[PDB]
Write an enzyme that holds these catalytic residues in place. Structure first.
Site, PDB file in Angstrom:
ATOM      1  N   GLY A 114       3.539 -31.347 -10.258  1.00 60.89           N
ATOM      2  CA  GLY A 114       3.910 -32.732  -9.985  1.00 60.89           C
ATOM      3  C   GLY A 114       2.943 -33.289  -8.958  1.00 60.89           C
ATOM      4  N   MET A 137      17.816 -34.072 -17.330  1.00 61.80           N
ATOM      5  CA  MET A 137      17.747 -34.931 -18.517  1.00 61.80           C
ATOM      6  C   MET A 137      17.045 -34.156 -19.626  1.00 61.80           C
ATOM      7  SD  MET A 137      19.257 -37.733 -17.449  1.00 61.80           S
ATOM      8  CE  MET A 137      18.751 -39.169 -18.418  1.00 61.80           C
ATOM      9  N   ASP A 184       7.647 -50.618 -11.427  1.00 63.39           N
ATOM     10  CA  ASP A 184       7.061 -49.613 -12.325  1.00 63.39           C
ATOM     11  C   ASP A 184       7.999 -49.309 -13.508  1.00 63.39           C
ATOM     12  OD1 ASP A 184       4.715 -48.923 -10.425  1.00 63.39           O
ATOM     13  OD2 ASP A 184       6.448 -48.359  -9.187  1.00 63.39           O
ATOM     14  N   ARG A 197       7.815 -44.603 -19.920  1.00 59.08           N
ATOM     15  CA  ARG A 197       7.482 -43.302 -19.315  1.00 59.08           C
ATOM     16  C   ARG A 197       8.304 -42.994 -18.061  1.00 59.08           C
ATOM     17  NH1 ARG A 197       3.895 -46.883 -17.836  1.00 59.08           N
ATOM     18  NH2 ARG A 197       3.375 -47.100 -15.617  1.00 59.08           N
ATOM     19  N   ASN A 198       8.843 -44.033 -17.428  1.00 57.83           N
ATOM     20  CA  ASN A 198       9.672 -43.876 -16.234  1.00 57.83           C
ATOM     21  C   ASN A 198      11.178 -43.990 -16.500  1.00 57.83           C
ATOM     22  OD1 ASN A 198       7.441 -43.393 -14.589  1.00 57.83           O
ATOM     23  ND2 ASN A 198       7.122 -45.579 -14.173  1.00 57.83           N
ATOM     24  N   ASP A 254      11.677 -42.785 -11.319  1.00 57.51           N
ATOM     25  CA  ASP A 254      10.428 -43.182 -10.641  1.00 57.51           C
ATOM     26  C   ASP A 254      10.687 -44.123  -9.460  1.00 57.51           C
ATOM     27  OD1 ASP A 254       7.590 -43.162 -10.222  1.00 57.51           O
ATOM     28  OD2 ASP A 254       7.463 -45.143 -11.172  1.00 57.51           O
TER      29      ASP A 254
END
Length: 282
Positions: free
Chosen positions: A34, A106, A150, A154-155, A168
Site C-alpha cells: 500500500g 469487502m 476523490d 476505484r474508490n 479513500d
C-alpha cells in the site's frame, strides 16, 4: 458535522478511532503493498467475543513522523462517519508497532475492477442498487459537510452482497470543471464526480474519457462535450449523468435528490426500459 483534523491533528485519531488490542487481531492473507506499508486481511475479535473479517493496513518499518501522521489521518476522518454505505473504521493500533488501521472487509474489492471482470453480467436493477448505495453514502458525507474530492469507482468498495461503500479518506477525469479551473471543491463538485461514477458503473468500469490527453479532457468538457451514453443505458440514467455534469454547479442535483431519483427508478423498474470512443456536445 465533519471536523477537519487540521493544531495537534494527531489527537483527532484518538477522538474518532478505537484503540484496538492486537491480541484480538489475526492476519490471514497478505494482499501486498500500500502507500504507507502492507495491506492484508484477517479477523477481529470484538469485545462481545463476536468474530468478524477485516481489512488491515500497516505502517512500514522505519516510517517518518510525517508518514505516520498522514497514515493515521485516514482514521481521523473515516472514524467520524457511521453509515452503511461508508467504509467502517473498526479501529487503530497505535500503542505498538507496526501501527495499524483496521476497516470493514469487502469481499469483492474495488468497484471498477469488479465490474470489468463481469462486463454485461448484472441486471440494470442490480447496477441501480449499487449506484443508490453510493449516492446514499455521499448524501451522508455532504450532510456532514465533508467534500470527498476523490469520488471514483476505484474508490468504492463492494461486498459479498454487492453493497457499495465509499472509501479513500486519506488527475482530473473525475473532477468538476470549476474544481480543475480554480480549486472550487464543494458538495456540487462531488455530484459531478458522482455523475462520472454513474457512467463508470453503467459502462462496467470503462475508464472515463479513456486515455485522452488530460488537456483535451479539460478543454472538451469546458466546450460542452460529455461522455456518451454507455451501451444499452436507460435514458433516465443518462439524463441523470447529464444533470450531474451541468456546467453551472448550482443547477446540479443535490445528493438527496439523486437518491430520490434512483429510488423512484427502483420502485418503477419499467421506467428503466426506455433506452437512450467519441464525446457528445451537450
Amino acid at each position: 458535522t465533519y471536523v477537519d483534523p487540521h493544531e495537534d491533528p494527531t489527537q483527532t485519531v484518538h477522538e474518532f478511532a478505537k484503540e484496538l488490542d492486537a491480541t484480538n487481531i489475526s492476519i490471514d492473507k497478505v494482499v501486498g503493498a500500500g502507500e504507507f506499508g502492507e495491506v492484508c486481511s484477517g479477523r477481529l475479535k470484538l469485545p462481545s467475543k463476536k468474530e468478524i473479517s477485516v481489512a488491515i493496513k500497516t505502517l512500514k518499518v522505519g516510517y517518518t513522523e510525517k508518514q505516520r501522521r498522514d497514515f493515521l489521518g485516514e482514521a481521523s476522518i473515516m472514524g467520524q462517519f457511521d453509515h452503511p454505505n461508508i467504509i467502517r473504521l473498526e479501529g487503530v493500533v497505535t500503542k505498538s508497532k507496526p501501527v495499524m488501521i483496521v476497516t470493514e472487509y469487502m469481499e469483492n474489492g474495488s468497484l471498477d475492477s469488479f465490474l470489468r471482470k463481469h462486463d454485461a453480467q448484472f441486471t440494470v436493477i442490480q447496477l441501480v442498487g449499487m449506484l443508490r448505495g453510493i449516492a446514499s453514502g455521499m448524501k451522508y458525507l455532504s450532510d456532514m459537510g465533508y467534500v470527498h474530492r476523490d469520488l471514483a469507482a476505484r474508490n468504492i468498495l463492494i461486498n459479498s452482497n454487492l453493497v457499495c461503500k465509499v472509501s479513500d479518506f486519506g488527475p482530473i477525469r473525475w473532477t468538476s470543471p470549476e474544481a480543475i479551473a480554480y480549486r472550487k471543491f464543494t458538495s456540487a463538485s462531488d455530484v459531478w464526480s458522482y455523475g462520472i461514477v454513474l457512467w463508470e458503473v453503467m459502462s462496467y468500469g470503462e475508464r472515463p474519457y479513456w486515455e485522452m490527453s488530460n488537456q483535451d479532457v479539460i478543454k472538451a468538457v469546458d466546450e460542452g462535450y460529455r461522455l456518451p451514453p454507455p451501451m444499452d443505458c436507460p435514458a433516465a440514467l443518462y439524463q441523470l449523468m447529464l444533470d450531474c455534469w451541468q456546467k453551472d454547479r448550482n443547477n446540479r442535483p443535490k445528493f438527496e435528490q439523486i437518491v430520490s431519483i434512483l429510488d423512484k427508478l427502483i420502485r418503477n423498474p419499467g421506467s428503466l426500459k426506455i433506452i437512450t470512443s467519441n464525446l457528445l456536445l451537450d
